[PDB]
Structures are given as C-alpha cells and as structure tokens.
Amino acid sequence: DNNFYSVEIGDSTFTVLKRYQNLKPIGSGAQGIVCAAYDAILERNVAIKKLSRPFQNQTHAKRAYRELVLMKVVNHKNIIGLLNVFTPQKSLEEFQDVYIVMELMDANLSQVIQMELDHERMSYLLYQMLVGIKHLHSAGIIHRDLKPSNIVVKSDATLKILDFGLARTAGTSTPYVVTRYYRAPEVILGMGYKENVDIWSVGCIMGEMIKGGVLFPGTDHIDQWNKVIEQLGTPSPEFMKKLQPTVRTYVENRPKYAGYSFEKLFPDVLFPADSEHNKLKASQARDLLSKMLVIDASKRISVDEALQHPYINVWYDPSEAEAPPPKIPDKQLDEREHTIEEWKELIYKEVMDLE
C-alpha cells in the first residue's frame, strides 16, 4: 500500500523504501547512524545513512547540505559512491529525515592496520587514498577528517574515501570537531588550514599502518601536542612566529625536544622485505613519511608532490589522477549563515532535487 516503511533498530527508527531490507547497524557518520541493508532491486549490499532532522541546527544543516551536494557532485573510483537518496515525508511541511544510500565496502582500515602488509599493498592503498584526496582538492575541497574509520577497503584490494560532512575550503573562520590523533599542528594550535592539512592526516595513517597502533595518542586535546613534539621534536622559532600570541606562549613554554629520526620512529624491523624492484624500499617509505609528518604546514609535501614520490608513483596513472574536477555549483560557497527555515528548505529542495 505505501512506498516507504519502518523497522526499529534498537531505539532508532529507519523508514526506507521497501526495496531496502534486513537492516543491521554498522557505524556513525559525522552526523547520522548508518545501516547496512540489502537492496533487493539491484540485488546488492548497500549502506544507508539516516540523517535526523538536519535543519535542527546550523551545524547539522550545514554538514548535511555538504554531504548531499558532495555526494552527488563527486564521482571517482576512490570516493565512496552515491547510489540513492530520499525522504519519506511527502511535503516540506511534514519533513524531517533524509536518507543517503551509498556503496558498502568490506571493511575500514582498523583492521588492515593490524595485519602485516607488504610494500606493494601499502604503497598501493596509499596511492589510492591520495588520488582520492587529489580529486577532492582539484575542486578546492579539503576533507579534514581522514582517519582509518573514514577509509574503506574491499578484498579486491581497492580503497574508498568516505564521509564529507566536515569537508570545506580553507581555515580559520569550531576547533574540536576533527579527530584528536589525526589533527595537524595547524588544527591543534588553531592557525587555520590549507589542503595539505589532509596530508598530515595521511602521514598518521601510513605511520599507524606501519607502527601497528596510533601514531600520536594524546590523552586529551592539549596532551596531543606533547605527543607530536615528543616524537618529531620542537619546531623552529620561525614557525612559532606564525602562532597566535596566546598559544604561542604556551608552546614556547613546552619542554624542548630533539625528537627521533624517522629511521628511529620507523626502523627496518618494522617493514616487509624490501621490494622486488626499487622505489618500494623501507627507506623510500620513510622518506615519504618524513615529507608528510611535518609540523610546519608550509614545509609540507602536497598530494601531487606525494603522488610523484618514488614510493607512490609506481602506480601512477593519469587517467585516474588527472580526471576532471567535480564541478561545484557556486550558488553554494560552503560556510554562510542561515536560519532553521531557510535551512530546512535548502535541504528539502536539494533532496527533492535528488529523488
């Protein structure tokens, strides 16, 4: 009799097209719980992200709009794929919930990080993330929250970036929104950010992959900064000058560190057999780690730079890497103020635009 319908998953209610069935719970996006579901029609597994009354809040509104926009506009081998979208409410009046259906992968990095990969594998995955990130940048978008949980794999050894709710263009202009262990200095110390902020994230992931556990823990947001400097050592004065004077003080007050050499943070012991052919060497990986994990954002390698690094570029393929930027409707410029009403309506438009 009706097009949608509902299942209670614990305490949360999913109301979804009869096509989607057998919901299990699986994780959380920036916003929304998320179910795996079988899509009877296309006869394949899918993932579905319930976004509850997003216009409830500038944030939820903003972060939602983003995802919708960015889930449609972006298309790439390495970015998670839009499959379907909808609302069950049949009228702007009535409206509250959005649902995004997207491809479901086999696992996230958690996961892979535990096992002992071999250079080709690491270098490859790396490569993929990067190209993925490259693609987003090529249209100004900075992901901002790259971490094992946002990255997904499949057993055909392929990789996809995911979750766009947090993504935008340069900073500053809320501090504690990006995951602690993955924060670049410029975000820990609130200097604002350029694309290569994502590269920081990358470095921690690669490192974590190798190290077997998180690169810089950090028992709280401030401790985090010790962990970084504990390991990489106190940054130059020339850098401190970039710091806002209030924070600038504290930092200059931190005990000094020399920090370890990369060869010490990442010794051979830690690596697979050095590769069949060259470029793919423990040391080469190290070299690249050492150009990403770099406190000073202005002395830090770019996606493209990384894409060329001997350890990555062995897989380099211009058909993937130099793909057309995702064109973004300038209507939106991802950070202007609005109200509950204008928010609710934007979403609905954008959603109804997408059904």
Partner: peptide, 10 residues
C-alpha cells in the same frame, strides 16, 4: 610491479 587484486580481511 603488478597492481594487487586481493586483500586479506580474513
């Protein structure tokens, strides 16, 4: 260096 096609989420 052939791209891989298997990854072991065993």
């Amino acid at each position: 260096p052939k791209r891989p096609t298997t990854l072991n989420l065993f």
